[model samples]
Each structure stands twice: as structure tokens, then as C-alpha cells.
Target: INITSSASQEGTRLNLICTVWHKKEEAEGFVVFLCKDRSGDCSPETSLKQLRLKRDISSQLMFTISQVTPLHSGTYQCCARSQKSGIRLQGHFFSILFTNYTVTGLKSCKEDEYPVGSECCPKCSPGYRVKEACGELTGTVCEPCPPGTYIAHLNGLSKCLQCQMCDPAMGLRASRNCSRTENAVCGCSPGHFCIVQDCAACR
Candidate 1:
């Protein structure tokens, strides 16, 4: 079934239940059991501890979980069994169950300069290009172009843009790039670095 919840907040009480359909006609002396798929299995051993099968009700079962966690996300199944000639017979069953959820809290970063724990959105300023993408193992973070290509003035920026190599003819036509935590990088034109470095030329 398509699972959805009335309350999208976390740390709230929720009710989860399932309905089962049997392939065979009603049998005598059969016991129905409910099991959870902890590791994506229909076996009984992997079932959650809080829920059990109802004795009188043979066709359907329900489970109630309080204070749900994100780890509780998974599939569950119901099974049926019967006694014949002093032996128990087992059969496969299907369930259409869903979970309800509530939201408790939101996570955020401690400081503004950092990427905020597993969050990385590296944007290159006009003159610079991203040297590499962010990754868990790579401590390099984002690298800026060396002095020859770009100037590093901003903090928290992902990359630096290319500089317009200095030219005497333009006579300070372009501005020098200024790196910022908010807006990183700029373009440099001939003789422009001598004047300034922070943004691209307007004309």
C-alpha cells in the first residue's frame, strides 16, 4: 500500500496495522502469526518484539508502535498455519500494511562557515570553476585557482573563477575577483589586477 501519515512531525505516537488475504478456503485448527521484516525477510525470527498475532482473529492482524524512528521503515508480512493428521501445515500469506509518522526535530549546522555536516552546495563565482566535487573522504574540500589563474578572497566558497590575464591596453577595464563566503570569485582583465579584483566587467 502507499504509506502516508496525517502528522508529518517526528516523535509522535502512531498506529500501524495490516490486512491480509488468504489464497485458500478457511481451514480448522490453524494459527496465524505476524512477523516484521527487519532484514527484508518473511521469517518469524526477524519480527519486532512489541507485536503479536491475535488468537481469535484469523484473517487480519494489527500492530501499534509508539515513538517511531526512521529505522522502523520496512515491509511486514502475515502467515497462517493449520493442523492436519496431527501435523501442522504452513502456507504463504500476503499483507497490505503501512506506517504512520510524526516529526520531532530538525537538524542544522553549528557554524555558518562550514558545510553543516554532510551538506555541500559548492557554487563557482563568475571567473572560477569548481576544481573538484565534495566527498566524505576528500579533506581538500574546494580548491581555488593558483595566483596565476584566480585569487582566493572568499571563505566558504566552493571554487574560484578564472582571471583575465593582466593587459596594459585595457587600462583597468575589468575588476579583480573578491572571494566571499556568500559570493565567491570574479574575473581579471589585463592591467585590471593592478586596479582591483572582485567581480566581472560590466561592459
Candidate 2:
């Protein structure tokens, strides 16, 4: 006997296959059964309309579950019983997580924000980076950019941008050094004046 396990997301279709081999002349009439979690018999209550059995050259028993839910995750075994002999095959069924919801407020979290304990905290703001995820008692933890670094826009980021460097070889000097929220401002040297928006070299 051969069997294969399968998995699916919630509200999707799941299919499992069980193959049984037997000699045509020696084997008499046999009954195939599908059981869940080693439970006792296969009855009308346990059987679903989606399941099907097909007897070809190699007896193929297929069990299909439609619109599956988390409750359907378990071990499923297929057994074939003849007057003289019997064979059994088993497999496991599992489902993946779809979404998470809050228990206290009964609200769902957005894709960008995740539920941390009881609250859904927003992501880190601009000019700051994420130090750690939100905890049960606190919201998202963020850290300011270090010296010589800046972040201009709001985002959930792990690192900050490096401050821009003003080149003095082209007659340019740092008028205003870089800050956490702005880049370094460059101006012509004392002897020169503004030539263009970004004067790489003083005239």
C-alpha cells in the first residue's frame, strides 16, 4: 500500500491519495474505509461528499476536502478489508495560518501592522529605525539615527542613511553639516559665489 500526505491553506481544496495492490483472481470483494485520527469506524457522519473511490487496475482511493478549515487538520488513514486479507495506508493533513485577530477587541490587524499581545502598534516613524518589535506592554520600539546619519521619510527600517560628505577639492565647503533629518549643505568657498543649484566647483 502507498499513501501521500498533503497540506492546504484555509478555504482551499485538499486532496490525498491511497493506492492498494491486490491480485484479481485471489482477492474477493473488499470494502475501503477512510478514518480520521485513528478513530473507530468510517460512517456517514465522518464521510464527506468530496471524497471519492475509484477501482482501476490499481485500486485508487482519493479523498478530497473542499473549503477546508483548521478543524480538518489531523491524521487520515485509508484501509481496505477483504474476506481474507487487509491493507492500510495513512497520511497527515495540515493547514497554514491565514490571518491573526485580536481576542480582546475582536479586530483584525492590517498587513503592515502586526498584533503584539493585545494591541496592533504602528511601524517606526521617519528619521528613526526599528530597535525591536512591539511587546505586550509597549508599542514598537524605535531608535534615532546616530551622528552622521539621517532618514528623511517615514518607514519601518532597520538602518539609517549615511550623512552626505562635502568635497573641498572642488572649492566647495560645508555651509551646514548634515542632521538626522537633512543632508549636508554645500556652498562655494569665501572667494567664490553661487554658480548653479549644486555648484560642484566655485567660479
Candidate 3:
């Protein structure tokens, strides 16, 4: 499922979308939901039903919450349920969500910035983090990542991530080395055979 927003002004249309897949789940017809906040229970949210100003169908859910007030921000949890699924839990048993909204017009950041709290601070750089943040006068300061930690993509985070380990006992070893930017890669070792990293039969 995918979600997109239109305008960010105080009184503009806020649009979101969720396109569902139907290879296995949603085999039958489905009912789409666009809930406010993360709702485990999609049913009985009376407020949800009335919030819709418009709706569109056809393998997707249409979302339009227009004329929003400033500082009126929120999250939206979306669910699309079919009649019954093989899993036997709930209808098709899947959920999707998209949020970080602010009717006050402060949500997402620029391509060069990062969403640090509600503010758009400098996004540091790839593989770097905050020695200090952006300010009224001072600029964003960045520092290097320690060994074994990484951050591969463009980011403005203040911390790097730890590397995933490779286990020799599990017939796994380092397939690729860490450069402190890219994550450490793991793969099957010499003679041991594990099908898709799950079931190992050969010794």
C-alpha cells in the first residue's frame, strides 16, 4: 500500500492513498479504512466514518481531508480487509500507515534536512551525525561514526547503526566487509549449505 499527501497549508486538501494487492489476500471484495492514529480495531471508530469528505474506489482507497486547521496534525492508520484469508486471523490481516502531519505546516523536511523532532535540522551527511545541530546562528555540525556502526543512505541522524552479525555456527560468515557506511553483509560459508538462510541440511 502507498500513501501520498497534497497540500500543506492551513486550509488545503490533505490526500492519502493506499493501493492494495490481491494475489492471495483480498481474494474477494474488500473494504478500505483510513483511520486516525494507529488503531488495532478498525471497527467501531465512529469518528473515522464521518471524517471522509470524498472517497474513490478500484483496488485502492481514496483519502481527502480538506479544509484542515493549522496545528491540527495527526497520524492515519489504514487497513484493507477482504472477506476471509487463509491465515484465519482477521480479514486478510494486513495494515498500512502514513503520518507525521501538521496542519500548522511543519512536518516533512527538505531533501538536505532531516526531521529531528518537529524541526528540520541539517541532515548531517551520509555516515555522519550531529556534533551539534542547526541553529539561529550556528550551523549543523557532524562527527564520524565509530567502528562497527554504519549509516549508508543520505541522513541527518545523530547516531549510527550497529552492524548485523555473521554466525559461523549457522554456516554464515562475512560476505562483504564494512566500510562504516555500508552495512556488513552475511552469506553462507564454505561447504555448509543452508537453503535461503533458513533450513540447513548439508554438513
Candidate 4:
């Protein structure tokens, strides 16, 4: 008798095979048993339905098991008995092992960058603000600053900055109102005119 072992994942199927060799006439009234552990006893209650017997020739007997689990992992023996010849043959022992799947090769990104799809992406550009960070399937999302606010540098900030106010007491007035992306423009008041690129008083 010859025996072989097999292995598979937790949820996958498993198979075991046993082959026996003998004379044609001696093969008659022969019975085969698959036993677990070290016990040599054979019985219907001890055998499983997964165990099957196939005979293609008098010289060989085949035994097979299908859909095995971790609980089936142990020592096994294939025993063949011939009622006519009063002869018995036992095959060598075999074992099976199971393993689990694990993930690998996940790369790390910089502080200012995050994973996007398969690679890393930078944060929002200077003028815009980040509405959302890059995700497993999508890239970073950004939106322009609203009026009365400004963002002058690239960042992953969730909110835009507040625009600076023109101080009338300092001889300054609104030369241009604040916009979605830029700060308010300050210049000389109505009674004052340009004294420099940044006017401070009237001429």
C-alpha cells in the first residue's frame, strides 16, 4: 500500500490518495480502510463519506478524499485486508499543513502627500484649499477660497484664510475688493494719492 498527503488554504479543498498492489485473484473480497492517528481499527462509523474506493485493475486499489479542512490535519494510514488470502497491508504515514494569506508591499507617503490610486499625490496648490485628502481610489480634492478670505500658500488645510482689512485711520482704503483667491488690495484714501507702489499718504 502507498500513501500520499496534501495541503490547502483554510477555505479551499484538499485531496489524499492511496494505492495498493496485489495479485488479481487475491484482490477479491478485499476491503480498504482510512484510519486517523495511530489506531489500526477499521469500521463504518470511523470512515467518512469523503473516502472513496476505485479499482481499475487487480493489481491496484485507489482510495481518495475530497474537500478537507484543518481539522483533518493529522497522521493517516491506508490499510488493505483480503478476506480470501487472510492477508493485510498497511501504507506509510503522511501529513498535511494549512497556511493563511497575508498582505505585503504597502508603501508609505510623505507628510504633505497621500496615497491616490496606486501612487502618492501632493496637497492642494498655493491658491486653492483642500476639500478632501487623497483616498484609495481618488486623488486630492480642492476648492477656491471664498470672498473675504485668501490662501497664499500650498497646503492641505480644510478651511481657507481670512482676508486682511484696510485700515482707514492709517490713510488706507479698498483699492480692490477681496476675491475668492486673492487678498483685498489696499491703497491711499480718496483724499490721498500714490506716494509709492504702496501709497501711504496724499501728494
Query: TM-scores for all candidates?
Result: 0.27, 0.37, 0.42, 0.36
Q: How many clashes would you count in candidate 3?
A: 2
User: Candidate 3, overall lDDT?
Assistant: 0.47
- In order, the Cα lDDT scores of the candidates are 0.33, 0.49, 0.47, 0.51
Per-candidate clashes, comma-separated: 22, 0, 2, 0
Number of the top candidate by TM-score? 3
- Candidate 4 residue pairs in clash (backbone atoms < 3 Å): none
lDDT against true structure, model 1: 0.33
Off by over 4 Å in 1: 1-11, 20-28, 38-41, 49-58, 83-203
Off by over 4 Å in 4: 1-11, 42-45, 49-67, 100-203
Candidate 1 on 8-64: residue-level lDDT in tens?
Answer: 222455544333333333334434445544222323454443222332322434455
Tens digits of lDDT, candidate 2, 84-122: 332222222222332331112111754334455566643
lDDT of 4 by residue, 87-155 (tens): 444343344443432212111755445445566644554456666554432334455566678776555
Q: Could you tell me which residue pairs clash in candidate 3? A: 71-104, 123-156
lDDT of 4 at 176: 78
The TM-score of candidate 3 is 0.42
The order of the candidates by TM-score, greatest first, is 3, 2, 4, 1
